[PDB]
Amino acid sequence: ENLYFQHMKHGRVFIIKSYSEDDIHRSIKYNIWCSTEHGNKRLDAAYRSMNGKGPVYLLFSVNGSGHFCGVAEMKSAVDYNTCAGVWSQDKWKGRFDVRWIFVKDVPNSQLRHIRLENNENKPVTNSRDTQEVPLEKAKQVLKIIASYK
Numbered sequence: 001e002n003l004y005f006q007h008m009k010h011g012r013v014f015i016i017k018s019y020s021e022d023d024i025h026r027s028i029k030y031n032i033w034c035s036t037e038h039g040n041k042r043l044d045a046a047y048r049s050m051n052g053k054g055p056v057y058l059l060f061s062v063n064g065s066g067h068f069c070g071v072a073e074m075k076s077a078v079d080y081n082t083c084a085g086v087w088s089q090d091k092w093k094g095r096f097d098v099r100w101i102f103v104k105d106v107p108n109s110q111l112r113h114i115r116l117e118n119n120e121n122k123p124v125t126n127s128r129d130t131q132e133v134p135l136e137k138a139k140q141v142l143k144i145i146a147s148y149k
């Protein structure tokens with residue numbers, strides 16, 4: 001429980017929502033990801049402003065699944081000019097590296113009581129893709145996911 005993410009000063013944490021589980025599986029296999037155009041720009045700015053002084057974490061969830069499916073750290077800036085059609089749909093353009101840390105399904109029931117003060121106090125489980133999570137709430141989510149059994 002407190003073994004995980006006890007030292008996570010600095011850094012920023014985002015929700016990732018996918019409408020394709022196959023895309024997630026490919027992310028886990030090859031340690032890469034891509035968001036929407038606006039989502040890519042958000043993650044890119046966060047990663048770049050962090051300038052390596054802390055981690056950028058990604059909380060992954062397949063839309064409609066009722067569970068989060070793991071955690072990865074973002075590991076490069078966004079390359080916007082990359083091979084087309086590598087994902088479930090052609091609209092996913094560009095690429096950045098990640099490193100997956102946890103691959104595990106955690107029911108939303110374990111997380112829905114955490115609310116985002118930056119998103120009208122909505123449960124963290126009702127977030128859209130690349131919703132940023134306040135650090136103290138992110139620390140709570142990461143610990144729950146890490147320790148869930």
Ligand SMILES: CNc1nc(NC)c2ncn(C)c2n1
Binds near residue numbers: 129
């Ligand atoms: C439909 N598959 C899919 N793939 C993504 N990245 C490759 C993604 N990022 C945000 N959403 C909603 C996404 N959906």
Ligand SMILES: [Cl-]
Binds near residue numbers: 082086095
């Ligand atoms: Cl590629």
